[PDB]
Amino acid sequence: HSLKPWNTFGIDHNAQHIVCAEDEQQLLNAWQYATAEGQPVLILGEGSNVLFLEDYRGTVIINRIKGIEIHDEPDAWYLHVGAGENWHRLVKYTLQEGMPGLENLALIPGCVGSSPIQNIGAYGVELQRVCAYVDSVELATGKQVRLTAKECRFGYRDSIFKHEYQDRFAIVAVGLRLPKEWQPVLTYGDLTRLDPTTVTPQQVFNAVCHMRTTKLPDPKVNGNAGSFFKNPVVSAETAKALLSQFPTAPNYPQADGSVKLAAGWLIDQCQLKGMQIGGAAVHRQQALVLINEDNAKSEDVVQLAHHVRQKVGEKFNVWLEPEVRFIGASGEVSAVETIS
Numbered sequence: 001h002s003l004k005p006w007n008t009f010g011i012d013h014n015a016q017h018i019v020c021a022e023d024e025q026q027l028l029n030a031w032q033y034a035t036a037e038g039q040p041v042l043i044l045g046e047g048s049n050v051l052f053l054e055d056y057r058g059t060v061i062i063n064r065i066k067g068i069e070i071h072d073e074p075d076a077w078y079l080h081v082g083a084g085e086n087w088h089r090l091v092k093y094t095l096q097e098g099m100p101g102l103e104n105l106a107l108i109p110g111c112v113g114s115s116p117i118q119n120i121g122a123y124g125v126e127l128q129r130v131c132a133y134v135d136s137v138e139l140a141t142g143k144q145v146r147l148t149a150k151e152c153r154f155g156y157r158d159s160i161f162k163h164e165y166q167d168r169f170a171i172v173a174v175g176l177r178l179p180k181e182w183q184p185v186l187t188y189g190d191l192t193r194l195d196p197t198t199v200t201p202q203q204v205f206n207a208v209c210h211m212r213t214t215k216l217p218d219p220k221v222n223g224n225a226g227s228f229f230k231n232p233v234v235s236a237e238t239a240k241a242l243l244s245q246f247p248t249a250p251n252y253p254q255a256d257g258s259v260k261l262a263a264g265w266l267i268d269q270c271q272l273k274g275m276q277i278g279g280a281a282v283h284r285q286q287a288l289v290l291i292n293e294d295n296a297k298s299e300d301v302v303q304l305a306h307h308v309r310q311k312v313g314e315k316f317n318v319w320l321e322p323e324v325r326f327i328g329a330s331g332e333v334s335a336v337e338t339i340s
């Protein structure tokens with residue numbers, strides 16, 4: 001069975017079984033069944049962060065556990081959201097319902113269960129800010145677990161679910177804490193033009209969606225998995241050196257002296273916008289996004305990434321690391337290794 005509907009990149013590879021789990025017991029059943037048949041199991045929300053490299057030897061579970069629960073506290077609305085829930089429709093609903101605090105993370109694809117995994121962030125906010133806890137099933141034992149946001153170990157596009165807990169657990173629900181006292185995050189890009197007291201949550205939603213819509217490709221049109229590489233963090237010295245010859249480089253300094261750079265700027269600086277390898281290209285309005293321009297095979301996407309990464313590594317000696325998850329036949333492989 002074909003994985004192509006199940007991943008936003010539009011990559012056509014195959015799995016032994018693909019299965020929609022619409023409740024927790026169901027998911028657990030499908031996992032127990034495939035691992036009892038010696039098969040690997042892959043859980044997916046919408047497949048918007050995965051690149052299939054090969055045909056997959058096991059079972060792919062599509063997490064579709066839905067439902068929202070809202071618990072009132074004097075300080076905050078607490079939401080208990082099913083993993084199979086679509087994140088942008090949750091952002092829309094929460095705002096429609098008078099519970100703001102998710103608008104900066106508007107239009108990010110995927111399911112709510114997947115949002116802790118890579119600490120979803122855009123426009124000044126990461127999921128860690130409104131995340132209370134995450135609920136999982138210990139797939140290997142049925143044991144139901146709850147982690148606090150602290151125990152989640154949130155990082156820039158990181159969490160415990162990319163390490164200790166990865167294939168051991170399946171997320172079934174995420175707990176969100178939205179403060180009743182709304183507080184607008186207007187620190188990023190065109191949001192700094194909005195005033196903190198006149199602005200409604202819906203104008204931030206619109207302001208964010210407009211920046212997104214102007215630069216980012218629709219997977220409906222051309223398949224992609226968003227920002228293919230992470231923004232590089234370099235040493236204080238190396239950032240100063242690159243910024244000596246390249247003064248206008250977007251850079252985001254840390255307290256601890258090190259500097260984050262813009263990976264999309266560095267790719268752009270190598271004149272790779274519009275560059276193609278087979279059906280895969282570097283998107284012209286945002287060079288950090290690789291796309292499925294025409295019936296792209298997974299090897300084309302891997303080669304374009306190897307090409308873009310070598311070019312930036314030769315020009316800037318900054319070596320780019322992918323944010324997309326590389327899935328090979330028996331489970332996830334190392335993406336940098338595959339594009340080296």
Ligand SMILES: Cc1cc2nc3c(=O)[nH]c(=O)nc-3n(C[C@H](O)[C@H](O)[C@H](O)COP(=O)(O)OP(=O)(O)OC[C@H]3O[C@@H](n4cnc5c(N)ncnc54)[C@H](O)[C@@H]3O)c2cc1C
Nearest residue numbers: 044045046047048049109110111114120121122170171226
């Ligand atoms: C157009 C576009 C724009 C994007 N914009 C952003 C952005 O602004 N900011 C940002 O941070 N990201 C962004 N992304 C990346 C993407 O939306 C995130 O990585 C998102 O969290 C993935 O959601 P998903 O449900 O599609 O995960 P999937 O791709 O289905 O899975 C992701 C990984 O997590 C695992 N996982 C998925 N569901 C579960 C579960 N229930 N239990 C255990 N593991 C699970 C999978 O096995 C896999 O390793 C964008 C992507 C696209 C296509």
Ligand SMILES: CCC(O[C@H]1[C@H](O)[C@@H](CO)O[C@H](OP(=O)(O)OP(=O)(O)OC[C@H]2O[C@@H](n3ccc(=O)[nH]c3=O)[C@H](O)[C@@H]2O)[C@@H]1NC(C)=O)C(=O)O
Nearest residue numbers: 121122123226227229230231250262264265268286287288
């Ligand atoms: C699809 C988006 C996405 O996540 C993205 C998020 O929405 C966005 C806003 O907060 O910031 C990241 O992109 P990015 O850092 O490129 O955001 P941008 O504001 O577009 O640009 C940063 C700097 O790069 C420059 N830039 C970017 C692309 C380009 O082709 N040319 C260029 O000059 C910009 O002008 C800017 O000064 C996210 N990425 C990471 C890896 O941290 C994802 O993870 O999938």
